[PDB]
Design a protein around this ligand. Sequence first.
Ligand SMILES: CN(C)c1ccc2c(c1)Oc1cc(NCCCCCCNC(=O)c3ccc(C(=O)C4=C(O)CCCC4=O)c([N+](=O)[O-])c3)c3ccccc3c1N2
Ligand SMILES: CN(C)c1ccc2c(c1)Oc1cc(NCCCCCCNC(=O)c3ccc(C(=O)C4=C(O)CCCC4=O)c([N+](=O)[O-])c3)c3ccccc3c1N2
Ligand SMILES: [Co+2]
Ligand SMILES: [Co+2]
Lengths: 383, 383
Amino acid sequence: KNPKSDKFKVKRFHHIEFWCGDATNVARRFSWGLGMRFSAKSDLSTGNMVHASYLLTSGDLRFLFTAPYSPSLSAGEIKPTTTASIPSFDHGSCRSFFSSHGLGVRAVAIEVEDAESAFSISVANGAIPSSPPIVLNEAVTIAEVKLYGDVVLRYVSYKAEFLPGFERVEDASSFPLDYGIRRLDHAVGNVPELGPALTYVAGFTGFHQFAEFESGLNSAVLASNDEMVLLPINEPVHGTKRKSQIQTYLEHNEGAGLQHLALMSEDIFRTLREMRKRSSIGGFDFMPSPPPTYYQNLKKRVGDVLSDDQIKECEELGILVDRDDQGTLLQIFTKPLGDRPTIFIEIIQRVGCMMYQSGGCGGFGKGNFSELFKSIEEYEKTL
Amino acid sequence: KNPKSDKFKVKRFHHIEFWCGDATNVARRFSWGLGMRFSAKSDLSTGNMVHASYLLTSGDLRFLFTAPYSPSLSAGEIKPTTTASIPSFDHGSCRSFFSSHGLGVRAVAIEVEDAESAFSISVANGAIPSSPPIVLNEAVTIAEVKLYGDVVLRYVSYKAEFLPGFERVEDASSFPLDYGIRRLDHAVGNVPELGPALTYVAGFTGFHQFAEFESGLNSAVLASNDEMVLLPINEPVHGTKRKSQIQTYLEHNEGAGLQHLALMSEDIFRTLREMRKRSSIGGFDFMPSPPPTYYQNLKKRVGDVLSDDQIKECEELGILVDRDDQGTLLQIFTKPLGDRPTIFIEIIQRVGCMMYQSGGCGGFGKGNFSELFKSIEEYEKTL
Ligand SMILES: CN(C)c1ccc2c(c1)Oc1cc(NCCCCCCNC(=O)c3ccc(C(=O)C4=C(O)CCCC4=O)c([N+](=O)[O-])c3)c3ccccc3c1N2
Ligand SMILES: CN(C)c1ccc2c(c1)Oc1cc(NCCCCCCNC(=O)c3ccc(C(=O)C4=C(O)CCCC4=O)c([N+](=O)[O-])c3)c3ccccc3c1N2
Ligand SMILES: [Co+2]
Ligand SMILES: [Co+2]
């Protein structure tokens, strides 16, 4: 059931913005670890005396890394005279965010038809405003409302190149790395209470609950009309045998925030080969792999979708596989991206639901809680 | 003239500590860019609820990257019950340092015979105390005094593995990168006034002025008894044709601080080949190279030290060459390590002064201000 109840026209995920202490070092690490190219900048060299912002791209995926300069560089400016390229930026907010949460996502940005209308309708329907609509060079409109914690939902609309005031990066600085990542599939938040978080966000967006076909969490997914903007939300389940990883997140993050970004790959085998080669030389580490019993059990579950050789490749790379009634999901998770056990990344590829591929084909891997738990108990028995 | 006036026994540079917002991302970037191996850690996985600290090593060079966790994790601790492995660490000081200065060096650490004696003698001779001597696991003593700005001189002494409470890193996480860097040669501070800075530091150390054989700075070098701990200090010269880069540093850093670290390489050609290959894939960028006229002029200046092929290799890599009356220096400078135009790195190799090599052989490259200026004017004439 998809009631198509979006209260304004939503296109696709546009970018994700990380708030950093040093944008340069985070952006360079992420570029090498994920195979993303340096594509635009806004910093002292472009006249921005307020913040340093570096944009990485891979296909349609856009990661923005922003850090504040000394406020003394811009102390004489006011908002009408600002040199910041992102008018919602505030030195105090950014330093407070980073001190509270450490490295993490500040903005989940979606492209809409009209960001001023999206903002007005959202606030009329309960959204807490964060930054009012601002028109940049008569060409782009940006507005922000609160999503959860200190994460904002950012609306961007284009009259017709990332943002005005950003410059394309020199060819020499822009090495054409590419490990196969192509777009953001979903972005997941952790909150203390799922019910009120869903009511709030669905209330101001009109996003509907996406259908899904004891492990420490309850979750639900909100989706746009064509189900290409997907926003899962998790809450902890307390009193469990093992402590909820959602609760550990909330403790180390100092509250609600973005838990993981799932990045679609056009070739998950190539992406993981390339990422795993770089894990110990500046890139990202991956969670420990399932036992061999998990891959032996894959034949019964997805033997009509993957060949034995393709299953063997999943085992080589530690890929997890899940299936719903409509399609199949290949997924794997990194270790946390920074110092705190908070945000991490998921790499995914979806098989099926061809009509274009429909959004969320194969689900989100909820079946892998039980399948991994069974295979580890079975591997103890094998031993 | 070397009066050997050290007021306590000093051995060698021991480590450099960076204060970061996210230690993981800075350490991974530096590891890949400089070819340093992950060698020790102190973090949540080792029981440290206060700070994350990651140690990189290349030869005898040790870089420590430290960032604070949420204070809530350790809110019930007091100094007698702390889980921090570096007892001088303070959440507030670290956040204040990073907000003020951005990514940069907090501590220049030297190994001494007795850190408690070094501390006591230094303070008796005018040093401003920063952290009193603390004995760690009855095995290592650490103490800190102010050096300049918010940079401290850290004394470490060992009864007889980096520090107690640090753990060696897993072989899988510890890829054996090595681009040829072997030790810290010198560490340079920028201050508003050179005279009072030299009087203060030489006053409490007994370090002597190291002999040197219009461009925006005045500088002097302080040296230990065997001239293996070398601490140059720069001040701006105002009213110049081009604005002093020392003054630009002071503005963007919010005052005095560490300007550059010079890292000795056992094979500067290999080091720069390896570093330049990685500049656009997560590593470090280098300053623009001298014009060909500079390398043509090298024959007259160092043609008795370097062959034509060795000079051609310097030209390929953009290496600068300088000479004093005792030896020859090969050097090159990176672009700033982070967002702000503040700290950068120098790679150096010294030729001559064999007796071991004596410290500071060939000087610090002061002759390269005029030689680069002449060669750029000459290259305009060639054109
Ligand atoms: C000493 N000795 C030798 C030893 C002794 C005893 C044990 C032992 C060793 O061994 C173990 C190992 C464990 N460890 C197994 C780890 C299982 C956790 C698997 C998580 N699995 C996912 O598959 C998943 C899927 C989707 C999403 C995802 O993306 C997503 C969304 O997008 C939206 C909707 C919500 C959502 O979750 C996400 N995710 O992270 O978000 C994750 C144990 C665990 C529990 C109890 C005992 C254990 C034991 N006994
Ligand atoms: C438009 N159009 C086409 C154009 C027009 C006009 C010009 C033009 C183009 O072109 C240029 C280029 C310039 N740019 C040349 C840059 C020269 C700077 C070289 C710095 N050179 C070092 O060699 C060094 C050595 C040692 C240490 C070091 O390590 C150290 C220590 O360890 C301890 C002691 C102190 C110390 O310094 C360090 N260092 O950074 O610390 C550094 C100009 C500059 C000035 C005026 C006009 C310029 C021009 N006209
Ligand atoms: Co997911
Ligand atoms: Co130098």
